[PDB]
């Protein structure tokens, strides 16, 4: 019967758990015990970016460590010149519930998305000189949560319909549809080689996907509430997942273990953003307690508690060259840390 | 600075001026989140993923937001509604079968962590099928709800001119079943405003206006530590 056929998953999961336990030989904490401790890190706010009118929900860095784009509920995308605190573009959106923003790794395209079930993609440079929507990306039966550009023609979007999609910009159609998540997929991050990407949904699971051929390679679990933010390792063989259970966990692709968990007994809030510095051993995780807390990735402990945000921080990302870290919060402010 | 920088700073100042103009509009419109369920009466009150309905009472502007194709999980997208003036909740109140589901929905939206300072404007919409089903013996609240022995006799009430005594004594049970779960928490942070209305009602947008005025009045009084 259907129950008899579905029962095989029980022993399959038992076998995979046994294999995972067998592959475990030494935790990361023991391996990095004798490494030189990271010096006391002090980051001070260098620039604050005012101008947004509502809670900032997403930010993304351009591939020059100079331009960043932010989205807020007033219905406007603002592109900032971080070095000079200058506003480059202010794009009013049709929908006023955007919760994701993407910067193409060329400087030509910016993609938004929210409760409109549409991933609008805009032309930054035009013969008309004004930013216009290249074409709306309909096809999702739920709110979008994360969009990440593959190339100037391919984009990968995660939505609330428990489905991630690969879109061809020219045809405006879902080239590939990823399925398997059992919940509102909230975050996805790409690898340095743009062939693999991970996803994070509300089933407290992380799924590894192949861009070209679809298909899910490995599933990652260990979280207790959900995953609100994900980020690949700079090397590309690991990733750290945010959550609402006050735990950040880093998983290794080559082993599928949970190498370390980043959590302090005095933290009960949720993580909304995670990113890595340009060495690997610095995991920056935003927190709901109006703060962002810097963790040493190798030795699971605390190295920085930089603060100054009035409301919860929602977005965070390190530049490509590791120059600075930008944090976005619900107080309509972006702050650059160095 | 240089010539290009002095021309990029000026362009940024135009954006700030435009952002200032939209600020005046943004803080002058009171966003509302219309919630409820299927076959509850959203379309009657009103007449992709989200549908905006903009109406204006007196001189103030309102921005209603009705969710569409969103899955049956309000979590992870209700966080976007924290600056909303109020939440419009529509209950059919005449089904008499999916009323415990409405009660659970109201409890979930009232006890949500993010919706701690957000009031709920209750619209017990379509109090006409209720009258036609109470006048007839088909649907009695006693069967579905085994707590009608007390009957929720109204110590205070404002019945419309011309009303069956059972009609005005069974609808207040519906109102009390919601006010009981509304008053069980909050601790004065936010309050519920129940109303009785039909499918077609000209005086439906005015109730929203009055409730929103009361909500912001309560919010302003708490800033002076007078409440």
């Amino acid at each position, epitope marked *: 019967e259907l129950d008899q056929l579905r029962q095989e998953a029980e022993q399959l999961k038992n076998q995979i758990r046994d294999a995972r336990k067998a592959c475990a030989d030494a935790t990361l904490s023991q391996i990095t015990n004798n490494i030189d401790p990271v010096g006391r890190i002090q980051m001070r706010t260098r620039r604050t970016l005012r101008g947004h009118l509502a809670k900032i929900y997403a930010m993304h860095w351009g591939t020059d460590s100079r331009l960043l784009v932010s989205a807020s509920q007033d219905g406007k995308l603002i592109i900032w010149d971080s070095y000079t605190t200058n506003k*480059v573009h202010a794009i009013p959106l049709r929908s006023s519930w955007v919760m994701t923003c993407a910067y193409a790794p060329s400087g030509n395209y910016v993609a938004c998305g929210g409760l409109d079930n549409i991933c609008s993609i805009y032309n930054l*440079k035009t013969r*008309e000189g*004004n930013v216009r929507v290249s074409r709306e990306l309909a096809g999702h039966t739920g709110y979008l949560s994360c969009c990440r550009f593959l190339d100037d023609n391919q984009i990968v979007t995660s939505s609330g319909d428990t489905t991630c999609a690969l879109w061809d910009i020219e045809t405006g159609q879902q080239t590939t549809t990823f399925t398997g998540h059992t919940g509102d997929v909230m975050s996805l991050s790409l690898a340095p080689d743009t062939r693999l990407f991970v996803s994070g949904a509300c089933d407290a699971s992380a799924k590894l996907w192949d861009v070209r051929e679809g298909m899910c390679r490995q599933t990652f679990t260990g979280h207790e509430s959900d995953i609100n933010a994900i980020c690949f390792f700079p090397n590309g063989n690991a990733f750290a997942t945010g959550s609402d259970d006050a735990t950040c966990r880093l998983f290794d692709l080559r082993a599928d273990q949970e190498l370390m968990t980043y959590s302090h007994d005095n933290i009960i809030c949720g993580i909304t953003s995670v990113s890595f510095s340009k060495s690997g051993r610095l995991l920056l995780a935003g927190y709901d307690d109006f703060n962002c807390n810097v963790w040493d990735a190798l030795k699971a402990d605390r190295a920085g508690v930089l603060a100054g945000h009035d409301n919860r921080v929602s977005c965070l990302g390190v530049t490509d060259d590791g120059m600075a870290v930008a944090t976005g919060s619900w107080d309509s402010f972006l702050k650059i840390w160095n | 600075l*240089s*010539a*290009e*920088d002095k*021309a990029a700073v*000026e362009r940024s100042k135009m954006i700030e001026k435009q952002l200032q103009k939209d600020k005046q509009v943004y803080r002058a419109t009171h966003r509302l989140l219309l919630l409820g369920a299927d076959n509850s009466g959203k379309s009657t009150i009103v007449k992709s993923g989200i549908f905006e309905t903009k109406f204006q009472v007196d001189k103030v502007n309102f921005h209603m937001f009705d969710v569409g194709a969103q899955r049956d999980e309000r979590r992870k997208w209700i966080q976007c509604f924290n600056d909303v003036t109020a939440i419009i909740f529509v209950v059919d109140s005449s089904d008499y079968n999916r009323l415990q589901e409405a009660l659970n929905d109201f409890k979930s939206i009232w006890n949500n962590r993010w919706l701690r300072t957000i009031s709920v404007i209750l619209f017990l919409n379509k109090q006409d099928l209720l009258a036609e089903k109470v006048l007839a013996g088909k649907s009695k609240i006693e069967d579905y709800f085994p707590e009608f022995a007390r009957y929720t006799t109204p110590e205070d009430a404002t019945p419309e001119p011309g009303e069956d005594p059972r009609v005005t004594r069974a609808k207040y049970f519906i109102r009390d079943e919601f006010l009981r779960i509304s008053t069980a928490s909050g601790d004065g942070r936010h309050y519920c405003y129940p109303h009785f209305t039909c499918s077609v009602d000209t005086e439906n947008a005015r109730r929203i206006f009055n409730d929103c005025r009361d909500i912001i009045q309560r919010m302003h009084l708490r800033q002076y530590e007078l409440l």
Partner: single-chain antibody
Framework: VQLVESGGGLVQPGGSRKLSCSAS????????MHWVRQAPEKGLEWVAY????????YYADTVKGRFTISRDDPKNTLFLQMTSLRSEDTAMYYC??????????????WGQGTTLTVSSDIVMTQATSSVPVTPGESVSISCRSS???????????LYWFLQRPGQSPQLLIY???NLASGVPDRFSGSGSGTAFTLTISRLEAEDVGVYYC?????????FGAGTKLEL
């Protein structure tokens, strides 16, 4: 993108006149355009510049306080009204659109112009005003800057231009390195803070013409003689 101007014609000296453009192709509000002069046989000469919102007004030494400039945004039309004229003002007044943010391409598009036959600064030199070339070979025009154009920001603010005979100028190289849109990838340029060279690899047809060099550091905004490339 399109611009067409009107107002040209023979006028006696001292006769105040005005001319206007028609930018009915793009967004006039976000672009700050200029006026560029060009004598029958001479180089270019920047005239004025009106920014977005008509907030910043700039002029040249020979045109300061003379050619009042105005912008009519609702009608998408740029104005430059001139008072009593002199014999010097005998140059076509080309219209050039320009935008300014990080990554912009100022002087991206040019109109067609208009003739007005009327009966200290950063001086730059364009040596070898006539260089012979052949198809398939390569050339190297050179231009120099009395003062270093390498600002502390890290850019260089060098602009290269081309004007085919009987045609409006087009932008090729901006900030000494970046290639403008719509031009072949064979065009390239580099140089130090004082020395500037432009290399045209794999010469082909339609490249025969005159090429210009101008500064965008500082605003007296100046040009060069114009190296004519002929077969």
């Amino acid at each position: 993108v399109q611009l067409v101007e009107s107002g040209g014609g023979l006028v006696q000296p001292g006769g105040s006149r005005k001319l206007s453009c028609s930018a009915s192709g793009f967004a006039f509000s976000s672009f700050g355009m200029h006026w560029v002069r060009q004598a029958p046989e001479k180089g270019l000469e920047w005239v004025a510049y009106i920014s977005s919102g008509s907030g910043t007004i700039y002029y040249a030494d020979t045109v300061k306080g003379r050619f009042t400039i105005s912008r009519d945004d609702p009608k998408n039309t740029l104005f430059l009204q001139m008072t009593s004229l002199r014999s010097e003002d005998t140059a076509m007044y080309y219209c050039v659109r320009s935008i300014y943010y990080y990554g912009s391409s100022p002087f991206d598009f040019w109109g067609q112009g208009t003739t007005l036959t009327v009966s200290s600064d950063i001086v730059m030199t364009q040596a070898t005003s006539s260089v012979p070339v052949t198809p398939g070979e390569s050339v190297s025009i050179s231009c120099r800057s009395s003062k270093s154009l390498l600002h502390s920001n890290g850019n260089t603010y060098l602009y290269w231009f081309l004007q085919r005979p009987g045609q409006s100028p087009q932008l090729l190289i901006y900030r000494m390195s970046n290639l403008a849109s719509g031009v072949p990838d064979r065009f390239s340029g580099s140089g130090s803070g004082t020395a500037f060279t432009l290399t045209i690899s794999r010469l082909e047809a339609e490249d025969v013409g005159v090429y210009y060099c101008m500064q965008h550091l500082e605003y007296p905004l100046t040009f060069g003689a114009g190296t004519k490339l002929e077969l």
